[PDB]
Structures are given as C-alpha cells and as structure tokens.
Amino acid sequence: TNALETWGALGQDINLDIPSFQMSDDIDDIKWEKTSDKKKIAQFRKEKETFKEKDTYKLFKNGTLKIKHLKTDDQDIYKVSIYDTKGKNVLEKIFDLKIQERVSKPKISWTCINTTLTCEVMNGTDPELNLYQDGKHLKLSQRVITHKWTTSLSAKFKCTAGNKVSKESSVEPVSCPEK
Ligand SMILES: *[C@@H]1O[C@H](CO)[C@@H](O)[C@H](O)[C@H]1NC(C)=O
Ligand SMILES: *[C@@H]1O[C@H](CO)[C@@H](O)[C@H](O)[C@H]1NC(C)=O
Ligand SMILES: *[C@@H]1O[C@H](CO)[C@@H](O)[C@H](O)[C@H]1NC(C)=O
Ligand code: NA
C-alpha cells in the first residue's frame, strides 16, 4: 500500500523524516496521523498552535516526527499530509514502522568434561547467531548453538547475534586440558 518500511528499536527513539520536503512561508498545516487509531498524533497548525497528543511525540520545524521510547503499540502505518495557505496538499508521505527488541550480548557456556559449548542470546527479536573458532565460521542458527569436540582444547570462540536494529558480540578463550 505504498509505504516506506522503517525499523525501530523497542525502547529507543526514532525519527520519521521527509527529505522530499523543505519548509517555508507558504505552509499552513503539517499533519501527522496514526492509521490504525485514525488520530492525529501531532500537527503544526501554523503559529496558531503546536498540537501534540503526548510527550511521547515531538514535531520539528522541518516536519520530522520523533517518537520517544518505542513500545509494542507503536508498530503502525504513519502518514504526513502537508498543505500551503492556498489549501493545497503539497506532500504526503507514509511510513510503515515495525519494531524489534535490540539484541543482548550473547552468552557462551561450556563444560570441558563433556566436550560441549553453547551460545545463546536472551534478548532480541528474530535474531541470527554465528559461531566462530579462532576466526573460522562454525554454524549459523536462529535458535541456540551447540558445539561438541573431542580433543583437549585451547581455542578462542566468538559468537555474534544480530537483527535489523542491533548487533552484539562476545569472545571467550576456552581451554580444556581434559585429564
Ligand atoms: C530535521 O531536524 C532534526 C533536528 O531538529 C534532524 O534530526 C533531522 O535529521 C532533520 N531532517 C531533515 C530532513 O532536515
Ligand atoms: C533484556 O531485556 C529486558 C527488557 O526486555 C531488560 O530489562 C534487560 O536488561 C535486557 N538485558 C540485556 C542484557 O540487554
Ligand atoms: C559428561 O560425561 C560423563 C562421563 O565423563 C557422562 O557420564 C555424562 O553423562 C556427561 N554429561 C552429560 C550432561 O551428558
Ligand atoms: Na505512536
């Protein structure tokens, strides 16, 4: 339905900008609306007043709308409509905001007794995990990664986790004399 997809982080702020715009005198009204609830979240009705539905919102002179501290409820299609003094619609841009939880630093666990190693990430939406040993790719996975060996070991393992909004990483030197 012609919207510009946008990714935002649960808990962080985000900015919806219209580069296609450049403010001026002729401009009489800039309206930002939230589709699903059909409600104007912010509006620049000339100096006549600066309306904002909440502190969660902020609208700038350049038409950019900042949404503070993203929450599950903010995933929605947003629309800006802006008009001059002669009543004309100068621009209309639409954004399709989806949000994800930032990923957390992965956690690596292991026993030398049982030749087993695990990498897991507790926080993060639809993450992707990669396991490396002394800089060489082991496995890619969406769920928890397991890695078993047999010999005595003294490697440097690296586990990455990432999604659309973040990337975290953890390296842990492993030494199993096993005897
Ligand atoms: C609009 O202004 C804000 C700061 O007031 C800035 O963060 C944003 O990048 C600007 N966008 C444009 C298109 O000027
Ligand atoms: C995991 O996410 C929760 C909120 O969803 C937060 O309280 C906690 O601090 C996060 N942990 C990390 C390591 O980011
Ligand atoms: C680890 O190895 C021991 C033998 O040394 C075995 O008995 C045990 O089942 C293994 N641990 C797990 C969790 O399977
Ligand atoms: Na919102």
Side-chain angles (χ1 to χ4, degrees), residues 7-164:
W7 291 93
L10 182 86
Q12 310 315 117
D13 303 342
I14 183 156
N15 279 15
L16 304 184
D17 305 278
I18 48 267
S20 179
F21 185 46
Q22 166 62 227
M23 228 235 213
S24 67
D25 188 31
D26 218 8
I27 312 304
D28 172 72
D29 177 47
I30 290 167
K31 193 220 316 183
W32 267 103
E33 186 187 286
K34 190 181 181 294
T35 280
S36 296
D37 297 278
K38 276 183 166 67
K39 162 156 52 74
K40 61 184 184 195
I41 58 174
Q43 186 175 33
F44 166 73
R45 194 63 185 61
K46 263 290 190 176
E47 62 304 295
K48 308 178 193 308
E49 230 300 273
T50 310
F51 164 77
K52 305 175 307 87
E53 217 229 319
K54 211 154 43 282
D55 46 27
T56 281
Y57 296 113
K58 201 64 186 64
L59 158 76
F60 309 139
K61 165 181 159 66
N62 68 353
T64 289
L65 200 234
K66 175 182 280 274
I67 308 185
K68 295 177 54 193
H69 218 276
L70 291 174
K71 315 147 211 73
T72 307
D73 286 49
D74 308 286
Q75 183 164 0
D76 212 332
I77 291 180
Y78 295 74
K79 168 191 231 169
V80 218
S81 301
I82 116 190
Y83 312 94
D84 57 32
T85 40
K86 316 276 78 177
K88 267 178 285 184
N89 169 79
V90 190
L91 163 156
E92 190 161 273
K93 276 255 193 164
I94 299 166
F95 301 84
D96 175 12
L97 177 72
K98 318 199 167 296
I99 94 177
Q100 279 178 343
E101 193 176 28
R102 272 199 291 102
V103 125
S104 56
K105 264 190 189 61
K107 177 199 185 188
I108 310 168
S109 308
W110 37 288
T111 17
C112 284
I113 313 183
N114 296 112
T115 34
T116 298
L117 179 292
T118 261
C119 176
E120 174 185 0
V121 70
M122 191 202 244
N123 288 337
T125 296
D126 299 316
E128 173 160 293
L129 301 92
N130 283 263
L131 185 72
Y132 302 102
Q133 181 176 31
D134 286 306
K136 67 197 175 80
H137 199 259
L138 288 197
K139 195 173 288 172
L140 171 162
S141 184
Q142 306 257 209
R143 56 217 194 297
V144 178
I145 305 190
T146 309
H147 180 257
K148 309 230 210 70
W149 55 88
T150 307
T151 73
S152 310
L153 178 67
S154 186
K156 225 181 53 165
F157 285 91
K158 183 193 190 184
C159 191
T160 54
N163 57 19
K164 295 274 167 45

